[PDB]
Amino acid sequence: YGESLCFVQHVASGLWLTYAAPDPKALRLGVLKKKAILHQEGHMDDALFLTRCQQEESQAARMIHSTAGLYNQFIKGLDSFSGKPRGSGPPAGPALPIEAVILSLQDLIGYFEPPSEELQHEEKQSKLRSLRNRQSLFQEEGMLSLVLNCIDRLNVYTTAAHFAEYAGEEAAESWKEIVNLLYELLASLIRGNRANCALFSTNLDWVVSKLDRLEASSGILEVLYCVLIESPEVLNIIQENHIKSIISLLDKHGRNHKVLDVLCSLCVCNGVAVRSNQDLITENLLPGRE
Amino acid sequence: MDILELSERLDLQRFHSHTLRLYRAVCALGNNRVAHALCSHVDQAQLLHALEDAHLPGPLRAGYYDLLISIHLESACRSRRSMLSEYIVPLTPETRAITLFPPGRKGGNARRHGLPGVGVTTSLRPPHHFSPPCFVAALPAAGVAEAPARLSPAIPLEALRDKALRMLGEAVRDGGQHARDPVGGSVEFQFVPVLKLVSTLLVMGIFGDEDVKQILKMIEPEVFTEELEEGLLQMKLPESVKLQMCNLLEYFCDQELQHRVESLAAFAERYVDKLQANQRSRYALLMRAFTMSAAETARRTREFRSPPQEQINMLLHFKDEADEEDCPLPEDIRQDLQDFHQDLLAHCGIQLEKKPQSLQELVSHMVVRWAQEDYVQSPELVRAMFSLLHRQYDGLGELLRALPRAYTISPSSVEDTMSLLECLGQIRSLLIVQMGPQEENLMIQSIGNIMNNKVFYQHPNLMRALGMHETVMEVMVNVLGGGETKEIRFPKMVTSCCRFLCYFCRISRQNQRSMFDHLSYLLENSGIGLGMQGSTPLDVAAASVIDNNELALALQEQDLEKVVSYLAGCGLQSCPMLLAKGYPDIGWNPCGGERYLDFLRFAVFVNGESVEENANVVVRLLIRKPECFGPALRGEGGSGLLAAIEEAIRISEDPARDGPGVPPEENRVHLGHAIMSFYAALIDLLGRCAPEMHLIQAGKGEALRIRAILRSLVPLDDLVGIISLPLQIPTLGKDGALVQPKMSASFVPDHKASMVLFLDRVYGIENQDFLLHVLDVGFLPDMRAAASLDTATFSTTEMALALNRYLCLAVLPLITKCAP
Amino acid sequence: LVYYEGGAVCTHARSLWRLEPLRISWSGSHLRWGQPLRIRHVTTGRYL
Amino acid sequence: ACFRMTPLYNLPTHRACNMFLESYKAAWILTEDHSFEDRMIDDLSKAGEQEEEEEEVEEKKPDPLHQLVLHFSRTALTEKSKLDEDYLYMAYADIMAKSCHLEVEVSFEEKEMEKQRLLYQQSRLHTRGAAEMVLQMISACKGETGAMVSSTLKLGISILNGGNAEVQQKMLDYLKDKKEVGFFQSIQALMQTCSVLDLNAFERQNKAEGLGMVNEDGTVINRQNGEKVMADDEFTQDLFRFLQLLCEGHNNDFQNYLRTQTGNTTTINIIICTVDYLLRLQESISDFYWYYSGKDVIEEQGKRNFSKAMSVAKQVFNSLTEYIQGPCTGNQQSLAHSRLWDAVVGFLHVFAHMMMKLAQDSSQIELLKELLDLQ
Amino acid sequence: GVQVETISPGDGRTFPKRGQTCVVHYTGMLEDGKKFDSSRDRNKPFKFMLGKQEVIRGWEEGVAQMSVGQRAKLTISPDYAYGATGHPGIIPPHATLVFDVELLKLE
């Protein structure tokens, strides 16, 4: 296990598991991803070398495999009850596992602690790059996109009762903490993740649109705060409308240290300043003084 | 509400602190317009009375202090630090006057070290430019972001200086008192803001000499006494305040090193004058010593025949004592030099009461004592501590490092160096901030002023010591980083990037050496320079490599490999800007290939001779990459180069096949002439890459086979046909107006010149009948063209002049060697 | 479809693969040359 | 120009002062010898009033040297995608290297006393975490050639000189506990990027001195730079000397660990990769043999290139000997099955034709001596 | 377009003539009365040259209407003032201004 060179053979076919080799025009495509085929003749390098994987990575893969299916079932249930309001009638279908979803979320955040600051620098760095590694795999298989789908399909319904007339009354009480914990999970996943902050750099308008929503204002604001801190590209892509939206958010939700810190982080990043962004912030906020 | 009540009400106080942080962020990094806006929003006397008030809570106190710094002090502090890192010394009578040690009754070798920061520092430092803040004036008529950025708000510097000094005195009084209630709720909140303001003012240099004396007295009285009280060092501080203390003392030691450098420059001035007078006397005895002695005169001559650098080298070379008896310099001019050398050793501390009475031992002792007192938990303070400790223990080595940066300038050019340094300060400040239109206009005008600047021509070593080209390349790459593949922002910017640095190339070859050192770094970024029109990092690398055979030899095979990989890509596909603009599609890109080919030409051909290793490796790369040949000479199913030229002329005759069909900008190239230029540059590349005739008679097998391979790959019949091809000549038409087919739309005799250059370089000309038929089929069309040229209108137009250069560079040398 | 790829995708969990012996018990016993077995991708859950 | 030159008295004063400043720099500041590292290190190591308090020693507070070493360790353990240049670490690593090494009939007592002093000087640092910090800094180097790893390896040499058994034990234990493959990956990357002799670069340099046109600054004809051939010879030498010092004293456990690391998720063979580098160096030396046999006599620049390459090869052979001694049976068998034999045959024929052509003429006697030493 | 209220009477025989520098001491408030700029803030009087129009033309008109040694309150309409644009950042766009002016000495 880790030093042997191994051939793999198929019992039923009796042929040799080989690589299909670079077929014509694959060079023009430039893709280094090449198909495997099954042929008795095989190729010279048909022997495989097997190498170890960490138990942390194995557990991460297993939890990915289970989580994808669970939240996929949840999204299909969302689609099932999205079309027609149930009204004063039972959904007449398998109810989504709300409690299993709940437990899965706090399990994920319990997998996603930020390191405690009291820990020494060595173990701090160790758990830091371990967490970065897990976040990289999780965005690679893209359960973050699945979380985005869940968030969108939940926030199409403005209120817990509004969700209830379509899905059921028992989910209405859970709905608030469901969306809050989902935003918290997304923040935990994206915090300190280059890939996730790059994804939000691609699509910031999602957070810009859902920031005004009251139900999870703190969670969405913390998400935006982490994205703005970690990613300088988001600050480049920000236009005047986004800054005005954040100022309107501060107006509608009152004075907030978190919101003001978000604006501070928007101002400057990595020791390089965007004069256009600073000028927009000034012209929009300061001259009023109210 | 009262802010003193806000002190008890922390939540609203916390919001006010976050407001202060936001104000700092918006005014930060030299955004002067927002700085003046914030100066209007927050009253200045408010900031002053806030500095006065001690009842104000500590976090808001630190916030007000840092806001004052980020409104007034930040930009001047940054520019001053950037200029202070570098040491430039002018020539002055005051410079002559200044020395390492002040004379006194105390023995010269044993003199008390002078208090740091007192005396005259002749180093040219940019006068801080401040704008009187008045926001009721008329609005500027000039457009926004194109008008120059305006200065930072003005402050009463002298009153602020005295106020900060007496605040530090109050801090000393409180430290002596050891009162239970600290100012701002903590000793840190009491000391850190005041120390930061003191640091900023010292960086400004507004603090006078006597002010520096009082600052040293407060920092440590007994150590800096001039001839109970307690010292800021002994009364002990928390970690962060110790960090601010280390920053202050690091600044003072920076002025200590500055004093060493300037005194050394002064001594250099005096000793150079003494050496010049001695050599004037010696040569006066030398034109006389030609008669008395022959061997003495001969050895004096061969000594002077060495270059002036070597002459000064041998004149100075008497420290080792091995040839101190040998050196002709007088023993007194030796002795004063050794005396100053021992003085410098003592001042640096190389030579080895209980209180240190020296900055060296003072810093060492305080660092060591702090280390015994506590184990520092803050890595930044640890690094500052140990860096300062190393500076103190070995400042002489740091002096050795700083000396190459040191340089001397004349008082006659000091005013021009002033403007040069100001523009440098603008550039270095601009590097910090990201891209903007105002920033691009500012740097363009600044580098224009630098290029116009006379000292820039006068002192080639001065901008070498400055190293502005590195920072210019840094701003280049920061602009290039964002979204480079799709489109390049501001080809105006990149064209400026050359005209400045590409002209720096044109100015010097040691400049070419530096850009050759940074050549590959420009090469990975050359993948956008070809896409942008005009001056490119590709051509800055070409201008660096050109005309220096040492650079041509030192050229790297892997760098040429990635360049020819770029060439292979552009030969694989046409450019996406072409595709987006909608010009007729081509399977490959001719223009990028052509520009890479001319770069390779400048690489292979230097000073009028080809370089053998680079030529051979370029042939290797060419045979590695058949895609570089484009459609012409395809190979299997191969339409020849002559047929491709025929189809290119067909396309040129065809309307809208070269153009958009919707050159209004004229920057866009006609596609047919782009193809013809590509293949002309390719043929010229193979020609100038072929080895020379002397190597041919030497009979080296690799050279012979390379020449044969070039002949086989490019058949001579294609060359003969291209020479034979009739070419449109600007003729009189439309009732007698000279109808001029522009070069971009028509095939050109400079392409024909590349053709004949490959011919006489590779195929050569060997037979009389071969020469005769080449003449009467291809050179006689040229010569009838010259017959047409012998006209007043033809002589007026520039294509006749182009044909004149064509003949004199290509046909005339060929004809001269064909004379037999 | 499963392909042969090289890069960060190798480090990613998509490159992980798992082996299951046909015999239910003592699966964790030492592998033997030519032993009948099944291949499963851990994240997908599908059997190749 | 010999008559043309403006005499220094008629020469402009500012440019003359620049000239003289550079001259005085080169002739005086470099030649002035300043010894400060020993006193710096002993002052840092001495802990004043620590025993006087006697509670802080019970808490085990680091003395200033230990604090500095822990700061460097913190910087190393801090993770960056790109390694960060640290002038402070270069300065301090140089200081510690001097403090350790501090360096004609000598008696037994004097030799033993010198050995004990060297051991104590090594102790002052390795008792403070120096070896672990060096391993961390190589791991942070990650296999990029630079002053970072140059100073790190020099400090490793300075602490491991003489085969410090306790330093070797601490390094092995640290590797076994952290158990991170990145250190060995960095070693392999550095040893792969170690350069080999190049005929092309040598000939380019030859044409360089042959042409040798004047430099623009003043009059500098054919200014000679450091030879492009064997640019990193000192780095290859001190890296292989680091491996030699690690295996010094016939430390069988560490030799086996270098061969294979049992528990690490991926194991690489430093022995085999060192054999690969030796084989590449042998091919390069064979290329110089063919080029030198091309002409009748050896020219001086090529003589010096060949001598420096021979010094590198000597370091490689000493490292291999330290690997295989003990005798470590596993290392012996791995080397036997490795590609060593082909490289050894290559060195054999190369050496034969060497001493032939070298004994042909008298001037090559010193290179012949070095040849015999390598053989 | 400028409304003038004389808090302290001017002498009436000495007047600022076009082409003579004026040393004034001003205080600037907004529509609702918030102070954005003032010479009191600098503690140094503001000096301006009549006729170069370096400051707002409505304000030069008000100063010209003013006598020497006078304290007054001047309301400037937007069209004479910054206008619809205001002063970017300092004065909100499309806002009129009201200034309080001291004229201690005239040279």
Author numbering:
A (entry chain C): 341 to 630
B (entry chain C): 1648 to 1874, 1922 to 2046, 2088 to 2397, 2410 to 2567
C (entry chain C): 244 to 291
D (entry chain C): 3634 to 3736, 3749 to 4020
E (entry chain G): 1 to 107
Please share excerpts from the published article on this structure:
pmcRyanodine receptors (RyRs) are intracellular calcium channels involved in the excitation–contraction coupling in muscle cells and in calcium signaling in neurons and other cell types. Caffeine, a xanthine derivative found in plants, has been used for decades as a pharmacologic research tool for activating RyRs, and its functional and binding properties have been extensively described. Mechanistically, caffeine stabilizes the C-terminal domain (CTD) which is responsible for transducing the Ca2+ binding signal to the S6 pore helix, leading to gating. Here, using cryo-EM, we explore multiple xanthine derivatives and related compounds and identify 4-oxopyrimidine/2-pyridone as the minimal motif necessary for binding to the xanthine/caffeine binding site in RyRs.
